[PDB]
Amino acid sequence: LPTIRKIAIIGAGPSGLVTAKALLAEKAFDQVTLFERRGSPGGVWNYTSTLSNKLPVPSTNPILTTEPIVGPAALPVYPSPLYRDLQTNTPIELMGYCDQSFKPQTLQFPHRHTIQEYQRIYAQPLLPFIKLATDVLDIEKKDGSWVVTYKGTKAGSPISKDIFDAVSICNGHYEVPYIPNIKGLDEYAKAVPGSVLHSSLFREPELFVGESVLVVGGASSANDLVRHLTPVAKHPIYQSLLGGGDIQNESLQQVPEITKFDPTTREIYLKGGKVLSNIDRVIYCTGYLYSVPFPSLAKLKSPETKLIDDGSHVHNVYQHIFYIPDPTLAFVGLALHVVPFPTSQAQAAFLARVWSGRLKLPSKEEQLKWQDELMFSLSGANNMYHSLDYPKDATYINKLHDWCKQATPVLEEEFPSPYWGEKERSIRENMWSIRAKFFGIE
């Protein structure tokens, strides 16, 4: 239905939260309800000393259900992948919503405590709009509306259903781990319970004192882990890069991809003949998979209606937001290689004006063309589908900003669209160098 009055937001993390404020700023909707399985908003910024109960090794299925840690004396806990000593890899000049600045004297790459407090503040006025400790089981178009099925998190809660005109899925994409099925991995992992970890389980580095570790992966997370393990793990630290690396010294030995895990001898074979033995911990820093764990959406498999396939990305979403077949279904926060808060805010502001009717989407065929062209430029690398590495991200948010400006009628209070000027872009372009200089690395 075009006239949208009741909206459901799946998730109360940074993306769902900014989506709510933008929607509520339209003064056009009668109901905006956020659903959150955690007892509080903030998404992954809810640091949990608790680890996931069972790591799937290997992990290649994007539909995997997240099992919360439960007990008789506590609300169920959904572990967050944030680790103890984490500091941002995004500067305060760029991260964070454009209309809530950081307090003065804040470190440029602050500890998570600062971001957890920043989110707590941001979300406080939204609490009455959120159904906390509530897990959304399924989402499906029935008649002319969306039927969202959910169950209160808490033993004995009854399954319930409510219907909305639109649904914005902001469930995040850093929950289902991605661990490639390698020869002998499974058996290797099960023979020694904590010998095979993933980055989502990392919390405290003191666990690795004296141990010989093999970090697998070459992304930012893998490199960050190597630096964090360097002062504690036994030297050297091994890092398995896809094409091998140029660093081979006393503290770090970069090696090629893994060929096979020898369950019997506990040896690890690397492409090129190199073989590692006596590895106490193998930590996969291979990222996660996109997920749409809602049976009615997950079953969709046709090229024009599918959302998920291999979890490399979410398909059929115009501008990475609107589900082409039916734009009353949207996503906020799918962007990869971006500054999270600002980017989700740019999408929320646009999403709000389109759903209220102050802005119109181009034709269904044009939206589909936008996709064809993207798919073509990916040359088969679908995990880059939602990637907006600079300058794509700067251009993207400025594009959404300029579009939002065209909304009509003009409202007395306009929910802002972030905008990156010459200065903001320069910082984003040299982000990793500014970060490297801040932490005295590289």
Residue 194 sits in the site that holds a second copy (CB under 8 A): yes
- Position 36 contacts ligand FAD (CB under 6 A): yes
How open is the CA angle 310-316-320, to the nearest 5 degrees?
95
Q: What is the DSSP letter of 46?
A: S
CB atoms within 10 A of CB 322: 22
| Distance of alpha carbon 39 from alpha carbon 150, whole angstroms | 15
Q: If DSSP codes are grouped into helix, strand and coil, which group holds residue 7?
A: strand
Of residues 252 through 311, those in contact with a second copy by CB under 8 A are none
Do the Cβ atoms of 333 and 345 come closer than 8 Å? no
172 counts as binding ligand FAD under rule CB under 6 A: yes
Q: Is 222 annotated among the ligand-binding residues?
A: yes
CB of 124 to ligand FAD, least distance (A): 16
d(CA 60, CA 55): 12
Residue where the block lists tokens 């600062």 = 114
- State the minimum distance, in angstroms, from the CB of residue 204 to a second copy: 4
Contact region with ligand FAD (CB under 6 A), list: 242-250, 259-267, 333-341, 394-402: 333-341
Mark the segment that binds a second copy (CB under 8 A) among 69-77, 162-170, 261-269, 385-393: 69-77
Query: Total binding residues for a second copy by CB under 8 A?
Result: 42
Nearer to a second copy, 20 or 57 (CB): 57
Question: Pairing state of beta strands 130-131 and 31-35?
Answer: parallel
- The site string for ligand FAD over 213-232 (x = CB under 6 A, - otherwise) reads --------------------
Q: 221 labelled as ligand-binding?
A: yes
**Token pair 């929950």 is at which residue?**
175
List the x/- string, 339-378, binding to ligand FAD by CB under 6 A: xxx-------------------------------------
- Residue 19 backbone phi and psi in degrees, to 5: -70, -40
CB-neighbour burial class of residue 177 (10 A; exposed 0-12, middle 13-18, buried 19+) = buried
The crossing angle, in degrees rounded to 10, of helices 422-429 and 392-405 is 150
Known binding-site residues for FAD equal 11-15, 36, 44-45, 89-90, 135-136
**Binding site for NADP(+): residue ranges?**
88-89, 221-224
User: Rule CB under 8 A: which residues touch a second copy?
Assistant: 39-40, 46-51, 55, 71-75, 77, 79, 84-85, 103-106, 111, 113-114, 116-117, 120, 132-133, 152, 154, 193-194, 197, 201, 203-207, 209
